[model samples]
Target: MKKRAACLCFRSEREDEVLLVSSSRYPDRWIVPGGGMEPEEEPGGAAVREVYEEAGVKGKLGRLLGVFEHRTYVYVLTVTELLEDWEDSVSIGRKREWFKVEDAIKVLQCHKPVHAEYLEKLKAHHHHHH
Candidate 1:
């Protein structure tokens, strides 16, 4: 029963664009920024840590997007800083890109439709918030 967390790192208050990273295994496909939880880390903190290493960005972690069936806790992060190089980027050649939310969902749909669902939730969440 391992829990996980991720961030739908956003470019601005518009929340239209989300950051995606190249898969370590595929390097061609994209996925959300996240990983297994650390021993003492909460989902929110884990989400932040995951993005820093995986997506090379830092931001204010926002709302709990949702908890998926796999116990993946998704959250919103308004990106404020981005690094030229990061742990995963340097070590594994991981690359990060920003996509419009709908485009991001489509990219993730084939390999990780579950991750796409996270953005689907964001649509509803965004509409609700503003």
Candidate 2:
């Protein structure tokens, strides 16, 4: 196994709604945009690429949300913004939508500890910026 770099694209409409993606092949669940890193690619750059390829969204990478490590590998989840139009492109294989954070958590079954940690970090960033 190897370390993998990935991203989690989160969209908030005034903190009212968050965006999520659902795979047509796996309709039972939803997830944030992300994938494994390519050889020789930087983690942040790989994260950016994964977002576009999996979610059809171009975004700027934000703070590192959290790092989950298993026996053989680590998953780096970073916060991302939706920069371009939410269009279905050739690389992506899913549909996107915006749901309230609560709803998103319920539907997607996002990693709770990771989500909690990231939410705090995001809140801190927001407070610092504003």
Candidate 3:
């Protein structure tokens, strides 16, 4: 089966939200940064790389909350980062935005379930870490 990696990069200071990027494929929809796995890249690795490529987030990334499977691979990243700004080129028309964690559920569209699932794990991760 084909696989890919993706991440929900968050800001430590903004515990109430996570980063969401406007999808290049669609003007109205949004998505967290993600890309297919590179030759030897694992899920988290791909997550970090794509997160940087699309969202400009770079830092320690190694933690999995859970996986969402469909016809594709969906890796939910748990270790929230310090979340940062975007790279010089953020697609062409797409822009980066932050949605309140709970509000994110309704904004992620088809991935709302994944968002909800991630929230459960993130809540647990939060309670565990802090």
Candidate 4:
């Protein structure tokens, strides 16, 4: 299986809340907004598009959070900002919800490694600024 690219769309307003999507196709697992990069697609663009398609939101992407390598490819996990107009243009295929970061960390079944790593880095980044 090829490694995939994805983004973790987080809200700065409430650091405790992370956006997640429940896919009907992949029931029982909650996922962050993201997907595999298409042919000739930039990772950043793919991240933005995936978030919009999966969560019904638009956001500004930040620096690369971390990278996960599986067997066939590498997964780039980027930190992203959820814009204010996200509620208006978001697509509705997947059910979207916001969960407490700690709760998300505890229960999310997809991208566990990425989430664990990103949360650590994100906290360190915030600590430096505050």
Candidate 5:
């Protein structure tokens, strides 16, 4: 079982809304902005960086919300910089938007939600564009 650091980025610490990006491979499925942790990166730090990398938006991360059984360690993130255009988006052709956290949970319930699998598919998709 492999573990991956994932970020649950939200617009505000006090809001029910969270930022979720569409899976490039499966545009119908949505996910929070996150990816594998770089060496020496703390989970929160990884969360912050990933949001920037994926959404081109900065975030102020909060506490670790514990690891999900799906092998993804989740975190609470507050959006510091909202996205206008994701110039550095993970996948240029993909969609990024904010949706209700509860709805995302429902979306996750249907799919095999794994950041590792997401990354693998994204990497494969991007490779073809290069």
Candidate 6:
């Protein structure tokens, strides 16, 4: 499988909310901001860049949320900056929004079930840490 990277952009340590962006393929639908890694690109580097371009947010890249099914590299990003205009928003008319963690899971469960798994794993990871 092709390797990919994604970020779960959160508002804070509470982890109650996450940021999602409108899919370029299905503008009316939402999905996590992520993309395939480029040659020589690090997983966390790709994850951070993808969210900045796709979701218009910048933040501290935290712990690795584990590799999903041994392919997608997901991580926790604490958003510290938000841009009024960003690459995808202007280039592709992509829109970004925030959702409660569970709500995000539900929205993604239908089409991007693996993405929902990312958050599910995050919650499970959180439980064992505290």
Highest lDDT against the true fold, candidate: 6
Tens digits of per-residue lDDT, candidate 6, 1-130, equal 6889989999998888999999988999999999999887899999999999998898999998888773889988999999999999999999999999999999999998989999899889888983
Measured against the true structure, the TM-scores of the candidates, in listed sequence, are 0.95, 0.61, 0.71, 0.66, 0.71, 0.95
**Model 5 Cα lDDT, one tens digit per residue, 29-65:** 7776777766566767777777777767686777666
**Cα-based lDDT at residue 83, candidate 3:** 41
lDDT of candidate 3 over 17-105, digit per residue (tens): 67777777676777766767766666766787777777666665545656767323344443344344456244455566777876776
Better of 1 and 3 by TM-score: 1
lDDT of 3: 0.63
Report, for every candidate in turn, its global Cα lDDT versus the true structure.
0.91, 0.53, 0.63, 0.59, 0.64, 0.92
Question: What are the runs in model 3 whose C-alpha is more than 4 Å off?
Answer: 70-90, 110-116, 124-130
Q: Report per-prediction Cα RMSD to one decimal.
A: 1.1, 5.3, 3.9, 5.0, 10.7, 1.2
Worst 10 residues of 5 by lDDT: 115-124
Clashes of 5: 0
Cα lDDT for residue 87, model 1?
A: 95
Give the C-alpha lDDT of model 2. 0.53
In model 5, what are the clashing residue pairs, if there are any? none
Candidate 2 stretches with Cα past 4 Å from truth are 12-16, 70-93, 110-130
- Model 1 misplacement above 4 A: none
lDDT of 1 at 99: 99
Please count the clashing residue pairs in each candidate, in the order shown. Answer: 0, 0, 0, 1, 0, 0
Better of 1 and 2 by TM-score: 1
**Candidate 2 displacement at residue 59 in angstroms:** 2.1
Better of 4 and 6 by lDDT: 6
Reference-based lDDT, residue 23, model 6? 91
Roughly what TM-score does model 5 have, to 2 decimal places? 0.71
User: Candidate 5, which segments miss by more than 4 Å at Cα?
Assistant: 1-3, 69-71, 87-91, 113-130
Q: After aligning candidate 5 to the native by TM-score, how far in Å is the CA of 38 from where it should be?
A: 2.2
